């Protein structure tokens, strides 16, 4: 009781994906996270006709973090169109690190890793 | 039939949750969606400046979280509660999610997206 | 004066080095700096879409690499060599480095930044 | 030994390029310099914007130079701050570098040379 339920994150990222705006890649992504108060926040990717103005699902999740009063990320699970875990892109790694620190857990294809190991400095 | 005052009040309230430690320039934004619901966003900076998210980026994220639709009016405010013009990046996002008819409060009054980003 | 044919050829020429494997939509841009020198840029996309650099972003980098200055005229082209409008984000970059009196070729003719990004 | 990366050359080149840096919003100027797989030296400076999130990192500028001069693959990169000390690429830039140099790209870091495989595990 109190351990991260990666399954809850997975299923929440999957459901969030329903709303993905990715008509340029046709590659919908969902993400879900636990904040340090135990609440669940989600994001989706949002693409633009100009490719460099697209927002990663994780970006939207960071926006949801602050919309709902802030805090710190503790656990994050990004999913593709099949529900499989996705590795965050380097940009999202930096956003994740800033709002999670080195101890943030990320679900990856090779299991749970920390931001300490995904973004060494 | 936009209650522009409800938008400014909403954007000011949203603004409390702003993450701008680097600039100390917090921003909030509120918008109406074509079904009438009110969404808001706040800016979220990053130690790497080019990673920062405008408040309108957040509102767009919130647009989709809450099931999509088209933006119909938007109001961005500064730490004093005064209208802010969206930057060029944010103009392209709003064009994309509201089209040319979307209305935006500006320092000099209401302007459509057609006027703010001519094509 | 400004020679617009020289920029459109220089842009097209530059477009050859485009890195656009994701959109298959290569872009070139050419512009004059206030000291008469000609600079170009191409788009460079990325597996993570939102990390793509626009042609105009590349040119802006070329501007500073080559010693600074203000942009005076700019011509962006698509794969056919036709004038392309800068995206809203690039308008904000152009404005920062050319100001309101910077001229851009558009499908409809020369327009200034002041027109294309009202403040 | 002949053909090893000369990190001195990269560091001096990055200090030099840093003089054209446009950083009025942070007052944190950055220069970067790279060897391409044909041996040519490229550079980049950061370019800030009134909208913070439209800022270009030094590594972005260098990537644009890579293509402007004919493409190729990055082989070694040295980023510098205002004191000429080694600087770590932010996350977005590690993603650009990865895409144009792959896992075996060498980056100089405060703790010595590291590869992109080490800096951005996949
Ligand atoms: Zn990402
Ligand atoms: Zn903006
Ligand atoms: Zn652009
Ligand atoms: Zn960077």
B71-77 and B103-106 strand pairing:
parallel
Chain D residues 80-99 with CB within 8 Å of chain C: 92, 95-96, 99
Rounded to the nearest 10 degrees, how much is the dihedral formed by the CA atoms of B8, B12, B15, B21?
Answer: 110
Residues whose CB is less than 8 angstroms from the CB of residue D16 and which lie 6 or more positions away in sequence, other chains included: D31, D43
- Whole-angstrom distance, CA of residue D56 vs CA of residue D60: 6
Cross-chain Cβ contact B117/C91 below 8 Å: yes
Distance between start and end Cα atoms, chain A: 33
Experimental method, per PDB record: X-ray
Q: Which residues surround ligand 2, an ion (CB under 5 A)?
A: B 54, 87, 89-90
| Continuous segment of H or E residues that includes residue D107 | strand D106-109
Residues whose CB is less than 8 angstroms from the CB of residue D113 and which lie 6 or more positions away in sequence, other chains included: D7, D106, D107
- Is residue C92 helix, strand or coil? helix
A105-108 and A73-79 strand pairing:
parallel
D25 CA from centroid of ligand 4 (Å): 15
Q: Which residue has the tokens 């001229």?
A: C103
| Continuous segment of H or E residues that includes residue B43 | none
- Whole-angstrom distance, CA of residue B103 vs CA of residue B113: 6
Q: Which residue has the tokens 């009196």?
A: C101
Q: Which ligand sits nearest to residue C51's alpha carbon?
A: 1
- Is residue B7 helix, strand or coil? helix
Nearest 5 degrees, angle CA D48-CA D49-CA D50?
A: 140
Q: From A9, A5, A2, A3, select the one nearest A85 (Cα to Cα).
A: A9
Query: According to DSSP H, which parts of chain C are helical?
Result: 4-15, 55-65, 88-98, 113-116
CATH number at residue D67: 3.40.140.10
A33 CA from centroid of ligand 1 (Å): 15
Q: Which residue has the tokens 């710190």?
A: A72
Q: From D108, D106, D102, D71, select the one nearest D87 (Cα to Cα).
A: D108
Core vs surface per residue B78-88: b (16+ CB within 10 A) or e? beeeebbbbbb
Chain A contact set for B40 (CB, 8 A): 67
Q: From A63, A53, A48, select the one nearest A95 (Cα to Cα).
A: A63
- Give the DSSP letter string of A53-116: G-B-HHHHHHHHHHHTT---EEEEEEE-TTS-B-PPPHHHHHHHHHHH-TT-EEEETTEEEEHH
* Distance (Å) from the alpha carbon of A109 to chain B's nearest alpha carbon: 25
- Whole-angstrom distance, CA of residue A47 vs CA of residue A29: 11
Cross-strand pairs, D99: none
- Whole-angstrom distance, CA of residue B52 vs CA of residue A91: 10
Q: How many domains does chain D have?
A: 1
- Whole-angstrom distance, CA of residue D100 vs CA of residue D16: 23
Resolution of the determined structure in angstroms stands at 2.3
- Cα atoms found within 13 Å of the Cα of residue B80, Cβ hemisphere only: 4
Q: What is the DSSP letter of C54?
A: P
Biggest CA-to-CA distance, chain C: 41
C103-106 and C71-77 strand pairing:
parallel
- Whole-angstrom distance, CA of residue D79 vs CA of residue B66: 42
Distance between start and end Cα atoms, chain D: 31
Are D59 and D79 within 8 A, CB to CB? yes
Q: Let me know how long chain D is.
A: 122
- Cα atoms found within 13 Å of the Cα of residue C105, Cβ hemisphere only: 22
Q: From B119, A99, A118, select the one nearest C91 (Cα to Cα).
A: B119
Cross-strand pairs, B105: B110
Nearest 5 degrees, angle CA D117-CA D119-CA D122?
A: 50
Cross-chain Cβ contact D50/B23 below 8 Å: no
Q: CA A20 → CA B64, D75, D87, distances in Å?
A: 7, 37, 36
D57 CA from centroid of ligand 4 (Å): 5
C38-42 and B28-33 strand pairing:
unpaired
Write out the residue range of the structural domain in which residue B81 sits.
Answer: 1-119
Q: Which ligand sits nearest to residue B55's alpha carbon?
A: 2
Substitution target in D64, D91, D103, D120 with the highest count of A β-carbons within 10 Å is: D91
Chain A residues 98-117 with CB within 8 Å of chain D: 113, 117
Helix axes C88-98, B88-98, angle to 10 degrees: 160
Q: In which region does residue D72 sit, left (phi positive, over 0), alpha (psi from -120 to 50) or beta (all else)?
A: left
Are A68 and A39 within 8 A, CB to CB? yes
Chain B contact set for A12 (CB, 8 A): none
Rounded to 5 degrees, φ, ψ at D115 are: -95, 165
Chain A residues 42-81 with CB within 8 Å of chain D: none
Number of Cβ within a 10 Å radius of residue D109: 18
Are C49 and C19 within 8 A, CB to CB? no
């Amino acid at each position: 009781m109190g351990d991260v339920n990666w399954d809850t994150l997975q299923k929440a990222a999957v459901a969030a994906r329903a709303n993905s705006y990715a008509p340029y890649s046709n590659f919908p992504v969902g993400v879900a996270g636990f904040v340090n108060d135990g609440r669940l926040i989600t994001g989706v990717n949002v693409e633009n006709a100009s490719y460099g103005l697209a927002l990663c699902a994780e970006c939207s999740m960071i926006s949801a973090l602050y919309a709902t009063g802030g805090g710190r990320l503790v656990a994050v699970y990004c999913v593709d169109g099949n529900g499989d875990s996705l590795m965050p892109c380097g940009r999202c790694r930096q956003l994740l690190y800033e709002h999670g620190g080195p101890e943030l857990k990320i679900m990856t294809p090779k299991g749970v890793q920390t931001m300490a190991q995904l973004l060494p400095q």
